From a paper:
In the nucleosome, two copies each of histones H2A, H2B, H3 and H4 form the histone octamer, which wraps about 150 base-pairs of DNA on its surface. Among the histone variants, H2A.Z is known as a universal nucleosome component and has been suggested to function as a regulator of transcription. H2A.Z is known to accumulate around transcription start sites (TSSs), which frequently contain nucleosome-depleted regions (NDRs), especially in transcriptionally active genes. Intriguingly, in mouse trophoblast stem cells, the H2A.Z nucleosomes around TSS regions convert from homotypic (H2A.Z/H2A.Z) to heterotypic (H2A.Z/H2A) after DNA replication.
To understand the mechanism by which the H2A.Z and H2A molecules are heterotypically accommodated within a nucleosome, we reconstituted the heterotypic H2A.Z/H2A nucleosome, with H3.1 as the histone H3 subunit, by a method based on previous studies. To reveal the structural basis for the heterotypic H2A.Z/H2A nucleosome formation and stability, we determined the crystal structure of the heterotypic H2A.Z/H2A nucleosome at 2.2 Å resolution. Importantly, we found that the electron densities of the H2A.Z and H2A L1 loop regions were clearly visible, and thus the L1 loops are stably accommodated without steric clash between the H2A.Z and H2A molecules. We found that the H2A.Z L1 loop structure is drastically altered in the heterotypic nucleosome, when compared with that in the homotypic H2A.Z nucleosome. Surprisingly, in the heterotypic H2A.Z/H2A nucleosome, no obvious difference was observed in the H2A L1 loop structures between the heterotypic and homotypic H2A nucleosomes. These results indicated that the conformation of the H2A.Z L1 loop flexibly changes to fit the H2A L1 loop structure in the heterotypic H2A.Z/H2A nucleosome. In the heterotypic H2A.Z/H2A nucleosome, the H2A.Z Ser42 residue forms a hydrogen bond with the H2A Glu41 residue. In addition, the H2A.Z His43 residue forms a hydrogen bond with the DNA backbone in the heterotypic H2A.Z/H2A nucleosome. Interestingly, in the heterotypic H2A.Z/H2A nucleosome, the B-factors for the Cα atoms of the H2A.Z L1 loop were quite low. The specific H2A.Z L1 loop interactions with the H2A L1 loop and the DNA backbone may stabilize the H2A.Z L1 loop configuration in the heterotypic H2A.Z/H2A nucleosome, and thus potentially influence the nucleosome stability.
Numbering used by the authors:
A (entry chain A), B (entry chain E): 38 to 134
C (entry chain C): 13 to 119
D (entry chain D): 32 to 124
E (entry chain H): 34 to 124
F (entry chain B): 25 to 102
G (entry chain F): 19 to 101
H (entry chain G): 16 to 119
Amino acid sequence: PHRYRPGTVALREIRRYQKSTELLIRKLPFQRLVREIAQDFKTDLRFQSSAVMALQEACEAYLVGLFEDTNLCAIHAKRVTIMPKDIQLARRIRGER
Amino acid sequence: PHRYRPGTVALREIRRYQKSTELLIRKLPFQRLVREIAQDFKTDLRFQSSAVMALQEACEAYLVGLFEDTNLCAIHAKRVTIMPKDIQLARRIRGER
Amino acid sequence: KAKTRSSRAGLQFPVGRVHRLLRKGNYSERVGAGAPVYLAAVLEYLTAEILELAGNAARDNKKTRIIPRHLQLAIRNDEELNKLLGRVTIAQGGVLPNIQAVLLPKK
Amino acid sequence: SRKESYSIYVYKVLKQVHPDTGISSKAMGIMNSFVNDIFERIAGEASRLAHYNKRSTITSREIQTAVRLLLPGELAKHAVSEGTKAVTKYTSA
Amino acid sequence: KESYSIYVYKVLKQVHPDTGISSKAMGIMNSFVNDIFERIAGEASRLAHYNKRSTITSREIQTAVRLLLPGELAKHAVSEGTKAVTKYTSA
Amino acid sequence: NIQGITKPAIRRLARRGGVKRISGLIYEETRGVLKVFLENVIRDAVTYTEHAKRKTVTAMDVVYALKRQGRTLYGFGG
Amino acid sequence: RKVLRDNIQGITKPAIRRLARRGGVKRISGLIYEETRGVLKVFLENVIRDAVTYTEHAKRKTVTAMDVVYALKRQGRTLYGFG
Amino acid sequence: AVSRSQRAGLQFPVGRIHRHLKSRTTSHGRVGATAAVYSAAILEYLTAEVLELAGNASKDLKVKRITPRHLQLAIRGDEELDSLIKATIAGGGVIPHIHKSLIG
DNA sequence: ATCAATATCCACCTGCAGATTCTACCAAAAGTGTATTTGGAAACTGCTCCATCAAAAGGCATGTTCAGCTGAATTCAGCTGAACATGCCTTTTGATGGAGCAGTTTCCAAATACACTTTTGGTAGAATCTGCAGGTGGATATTGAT
DNA sequence: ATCAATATCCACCTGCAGATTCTACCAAAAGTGTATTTGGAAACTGCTCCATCAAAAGGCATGTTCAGCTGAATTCAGCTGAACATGCCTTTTGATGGAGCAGTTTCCAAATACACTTTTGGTAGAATCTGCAGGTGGATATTGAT
Ligand SMILES: [Cl-]
Ligand SMILES: [Cl-]
Ligand SMILES: [Cl-]
Ligand SMILES: [Cl-]
Ligand SMILES: [Mn+2]
Ligand SMILES: [Mn+2]
Ligand SMILES: [Mn+2]
Ligand SMILES: [Mn+2]
Ligand SMILES: [Mn+2]
Ligand SMILES: [Mn+2]
Ligand SMILES: [Mn+2]
Ligand SMILES: [Mn+2]
């Protein structure tokens, strides 16, 4: 039967998700996490559905942003594989830590 | 003839300058540089002497901060020597480039 | 007899000056009676919190007079003040001594 | 001309916390920038809050929320206590 | 409830009469216009206060523009602003 | 819940960010970061809600919160 | 008067080394000294440009420390110690 | 006859922008006759510039309506717009880029 | 392992630049009395928001297998640190003209503040149409194999 | 690079439905006109403090030599993460109610603005105090060679 090499599909996926703009986290889980975090600050809240969507957009744009700097950090260490140390370096240099 | 090993004196210098607070760039050359840059933007400017010192404190803090971040990029590539590519990685991630 | 607003609120920081500055900034059409009081109290508490730690830094270096170095040591060594002033430069403050472990000679 | 400053108030507060301890003018410069900086961050946030809620008046309540948005956790809590305290004391004449 | 959609849409018609704009895109343009306005108004406010003034004049708007826009954008923005005031004060 | 943010979803995010090969430890690291991000935005947003004496977090609450955090978002009221 | 030229080279290799030491750097490749100058000039160009815009707006011919402080604040490099 | 926008030859609403500036400053601050005009002009210009670039982006994809993606393409692809507008464009996505050392 | 060779404390000492007090006007805080908003409290709408429910649909979890990437190990040309000689130019210390901020006045041009009168942009139902998402069929790219 | 199969893609159309656009009416802006104000611009000018000059000295910058050990290269294998086909269940979707609750009005009590008219805290220098910078010398590491 048939089998693509490791990396082939990866690059395929990069091209596909860099082309499109649809949110990449599933809405219900995300909405569920938002409400959970929110509950620790103020009990019994409602959310405008636009507020949940605004959060998910800001959040996906942030993580996508972060994976870009993360990738630059892995490349800097002559790697093609991102690791937690790469994320930590990017977040450190960004002033988020 | 006694002779410290390479790196002993660099470590000593780190400890020395991390302990003190004095400006590390010579003052007159820094002032001429301010005057030169400013003159290319607008002729016949005068400077309050405190404005030149505010600039020198700012630049030096900026540069020390950049070298801290540059140093982490070098260490990340499993080096101890900082290189132009470490600076550029730091400034890219900082959003300066 | 004239009794100072700072005194009525139990504060050192100037309630009247802070009210005047709140009006001068045209931050809004009106300023409530309690806004300058509350704001004076916050600023005073933050000042106290910083002088407390800077004062302690001075003592550790065996000094009587607080300098910007002590103010820096106090800010950067405190996690919440460091975050509050995380994008501020303290002139003649220096940095905290900090040498990455990989740079130390390997005994 | 007259150039107002927070220096004598900073100096009072210093004596309360460290009666034995002085402060250099350069350090006082920094404490002064600090107090203006924070004043401005708080007044700024308060002003925005008021405008967001169509309110013409900045009250202790706006200052408080601004304090909660601006300060990182433990400093927020204590600043709120001190501010609340000083308002309740102030308003009990 | 006020918006800038009407005005964004008029300007769209000048520069691209054939082109339309989706709803979500209009939302971005609205955010854009409120953002830039606050930035400029805010800088202009600070400028006046830095100079112990209480009036935001077109002069503050201009320096604010020079402080906020990056280069070519500022040059052209400044020109458009002066052109608009010139026409306005002629009448 | 935070595990509701799944490996393939995190995988897609990294793909959009141009990442080709992902260490297995990334998924957990990403969820911790994601959690701190939401905690910070949501706290600020709830603070705006509560200031407005409302029980409903609005899009504008979030927008103001993102703006406060220097993550200005366009397309939801500013 | 007198022509100002090349003053960037006033920022010497030992001054850069010193700055890098305070930033905790132990070893410095040969090309760092010219990168650093480039990076410094850009930073300074940007602060001065803003500082002088504040100065022109106030119809002054003299750059004040406040002009610089306001410029640094503008660019998110807030500076304490100079008013 | 005649609106301030019209006097100044702008599509953007000078009357409104004055009202907003008046709200920012208070009844204790003041706004000049023309600050509203100038501000309005700046806002219209930058709007036209973005619409111009996003409109090209949508024509180059042979599409009638400007969408968020076209706004992201136009903004991020223009060096001056990119530096001015660091906001997140909802529904914008990213510009396709794959680093050299990752290609087969 | 000892030591030599330097670096680095650490404490003791003391005049001076710089901090802490002491005075003397005054700007601005505080006290009143009057006029003006404000933005809370109750009594109620019309949404949107939560909660089911209830299909089918996708998308996720799962385990196997192995390509190829990461790190560990080993080499070595030569970059960069340490030390040194030499001497330049920065630093320090004063003094001086005079630019130009800046501190008080002065009166309009430019501002607010009404009382007006029109008109516009927000809204809630009508009147198409862009382009999404499919379905072709054609190269293309990708991977195993003389 | 080609011989051949396997899937991706990429065109060019196409038809539907979710969004758009257009079209039809009512209040808060927005514009006109008077009258009243006032913030900040013009006009000297007092007087900081900025530029400039000089001149003597030593702290540092420059340029050199030398080799320690670093960065870069190369090689290898254990093993980690990609690919995949399998089998299932959680998310999507789409009204439907129901209700909680944001968002309006209507009083007016409380609060805030405003306008004078006294009072006093904070400021600008003058006058007094005193921490510690800077210089020196032995005690204590610290480092690097045999
Ligand atoms: Cl890691
Ligand atoms: Cl490099
Ligand atoms: Cl209040
Ligand atoms: Cl004007
Ligand atoms: Mn609920
Ligand atoms: Mn020049
Ligand atoms: Mn299509
Ligand atoms: Mn006046
Ligand atoms: Mn090595
Ligand atoms: Mn193998
Ligand atoms: Mn007194
Ligand atoms: Mn000493």
